[PDB]
Amino acid sequence: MIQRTPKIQVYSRHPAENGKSNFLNCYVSGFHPSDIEVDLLKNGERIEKVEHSDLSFSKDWSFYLLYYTEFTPTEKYEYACRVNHVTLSQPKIVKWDRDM
Protein backbone atom coordinates (compact mmCIF):
# COMPACT_ATOMS: atom_id res chain seq x y z
CA MET A 1 0.00 0.00 0.00
CA ILE A 2 1.05 3.54 -0.44
CA GLN A 3 -0.65 6.63 0.60
CA ARG A 4 0.45 10.01 -0.36
CA THR A 5 -0.97 13.22 0.87
CA PRO A 6 -2.36 15.32 -1.94
CA LYS A 7 -0.41 18.43 -2.66
CA ILE A 8 -3.08 21.05 -3.05
CA GLN A 9 -2.66 24.08 -5.17
CA VAL A 10 -5.36 26.62 -5.48
CA TYR A 11 -5.04 29.15 -8.16
CA SER A 12 -7.00 31.05 -10.66
CA ARG A 13 -6.56 30.82 -14.38
CA HIS A 14 -8.15 32.61 -17.24
CA PRO A 15 -8.50 30.35 -20.28
CA ALA A 16 -6.56 32.25 -22.85
CA GLU A 17 -9.43 31.70 -25.40
CA ASN A 18 -11.82 33.43 -22.91
CA GLY A 19 -9.59 35.67 -20.76
CA LYS A 20 -12.69 37.31 -19.19
CA SER A 21 -13.48 33.91 -17.64
CA ASN A 22 -11.67 33.12 -14.39
CA PHE A 23 -11.32 29.59 -13.13
CA LEU A 24 -10.68 28.70 -9.60
CA ASN A 25 -8.53 25.67 -9.68
CA CYS A 26 -7.74 23.20 -7.11
CA TYR A 27 -5.00 21.01 -8.26
CA VAL A 28 -4.69 18.08 -6.01
CA SER A 29 -1.70 16.14 -6.92
CA GLY A 30 0.35 13.15 -6.11
CA PHE A 31 -2.21 11.55 -3.88
CA HIS A 32 -2.84 8.02 -3.17
CA PRO A 33 -5.18 6.41 -2.70
CA SER A 34 -7.35 8.10 -5.25
CA ASP A 35 -10.21 8.34 -2.78
CA ILE A 36 -10.58 11.96 -2.17
CA GLU A 37 -13.00 14.67 -1.54
CA VAL A 38 -12.25 17.95 -3.05
CA ASP A 39 -14.34 20.99 -2.96
CA LEU A 40 -13.86 24.46 -3.87
CA LEU A 41 -15.11 26.73 -1.21
CA LYS A 42 -16.45 30.20 -1.32
CA ASN A 43 -16.08 31.17 2.32
CA GLY A 44 -16.90 27.73 3.86
CA GLU A 45 -19.55 27.07 1.17
CA ARG A 46 -18.76 24.23 -1.25
CA ILE A 47 -19.02 25.49 -4.78
CA GLU A 48 -21.56 23.18 -6.47
CA LYS A 49 -21.44 22.49 -10.23
CA VAL A 50 -17.61 22.66 -10.29
CA GLU A 51 -17.42 22.43 -14.07
CA HIS A 52 -14.17 20.44 -14.21
CA SER A 53 -12.95 17.48 -12.18
CA ASP A 54 -10.06 16.02 -14.17
CA LEU A 55 -8.59 13.02 -12.49
CA SER A 56 -5.53 11.31 -13.77
CA PHE A 57 -2.81 9.22 -12.42
CA SER A 58 0.75 8.94 -13.40
CA LYS A 59 2.06 5.89 -11.72
CA ASP A 60 -0.88 3.67 -10.60
CA TRP A 61 -0.39 5.15 -7.06
CA SER A 62 -0.22 8.82 -7.97
CA PHE A 63 -3.42 10.65 -8.71
CA TYR A 64 -3.90 14.11 -9.85
CA LEU A 65 -7.06 15.98 -9.77
CA LEU A 66 -7.64 19.28 -11.33
CA TYR A 67 -10.80 20.53 -9.90
CA TYR A 68 -11.76 23.85 -11.26
CA THR A 69 -14.68 25.92 -12.16
CA GLU A 70 -15.44 29.29 -13.56
CA PHE A 71 -15.70 31.80 -10.72
CA THR A 72 -15.88 35.56 -10.27
CA PRO A 73 -13.61 36.24 -7.28
CA THR A 74 -14.51 39.37 -5.29
CA GLU A 75 -13.17 40.67 -1.95
CA LYS A 76 -16.40 39.55 -0.22
CA TYR A 77 -15.46 35.86 -0.69
CA GLU A 78 -12.49 33.77 0.32
CA TYR A 79 -12.03 30.83 -2.03
CA ALA A 80 -10.39 27.71 -1.04
CA CYS A 81 -10.02 24.18 -1.89
CA ARG A 82 -10.97 21.71 0.70
CA VAL A 83 -9.55 18.29 0.37
CA ASN A 84 -10.29 15.33 2.40
CA HIS A 85 -8.16 12.36 1.96
CA VAL A 86 -7.25 9.49 4.12
CA THR A 87 -3.82 11.06 4.56
CA LEU A 88 -5.41 14.21 5.93
CA SER A 89 -6.60 13.74 9.44
CA GLN A 90 -8.55 17.00 8.98
CA PRO A 91 -9.93 18.35 5.70
CA LYS A 92 -7.13 20.42 4.26
CA ILE A 93 -8.41 23.83 3.27
CA VAL A 94 -6.03 25.63 0.99
CA LYS A 95 -7.10 29.23 0.65
CA TRP A 96 -6.93 30.75 -2.77
CA ASP A 97 -4.28 33.43 -2.52
CA ARG A 98 -6.11 36.21 -4.47
CA ASP A 99 -2.72 36.89 -6.19
CA MET A 100 -2.63 33.23 -7.42
Numbering used by the authors: 0 to 99
Article excerpt on this structure:
Here, we report the use of the TPBLA to explore the role of the protein sequence in determining the aggregation of the naturally amyloidogenic protein, β2m. β2m is 99 residues in length (10.8 kDa) and has a seven-stranded β-sandwich immunoglobulin fold that is stabilized by a single disulphide bond linking Cys25 and Cys80 (31, 32). The protein forms the noncovalently bound light chain of the major histocompatibility complex class 1 (MHC 1) and is important for antigen presentation. Another example is β2m, in which aggregation of the wild-type (WT) protein is associated with the deposition of amyloid fibrils in the joints of patients undergoing long-term renal dialysis (dialysis-related amyloidosis [DRA]). More recently, two single-point variants of this protein, D76N and V27M, have been identified in amyloid deposits in the viscera or tongue, respectively, with the former occurring in the absence of kidney disease.
To examine the structural effect of other amino acid substitutions at this site, the crystal structures of seven variants (D76E-, D76A-, D76S-, D76G-, D76Q-, D76Y-, and D76K-β2m) were determined at high resolution (1.15 to 1.52 Å). Comparison of the crystal structures of D76E-, D76A-, D76S-, D76G-, D76Q-, D76Y-, and D76K-β2m with those of WT- and D76N-β2m revealed no substantial differences that could explain their different stabilities and aggregation propensities (RMSD < 0.6 Å over all heavy atoms). For D76N-β2m, the network of hydrogen bonds involving the sidechains of N42, T73, and Y78 found in the CD and EF loops of WT-β2m is maintained in the variant. For other variants, the loop structure is maintained despite these hydrogen bonds either not forming (D76A-, D76G-, and D76Y-β2m), or being reduced in number (D76K-β2m hydrogen bonds to N42, and D76S-β2m hydrogen bonds to N42 and T73). Comparing protein stability and aggregation suggests that variants that are most (Tm;app > 60 °C; WT-β2m) or least stable (Tm;app ≤ 48 °C; D76L-, D76P-, D76I-, D76W-, D76F-, D76C-, and D76R-β2m) either lose the ability to form amyloid fibrils or do so very slowly (with the sole exception of D76M-β2m: Tm;app 48.7 ± 0.4 °C and Thalf 10.3 ± 1.2 h).
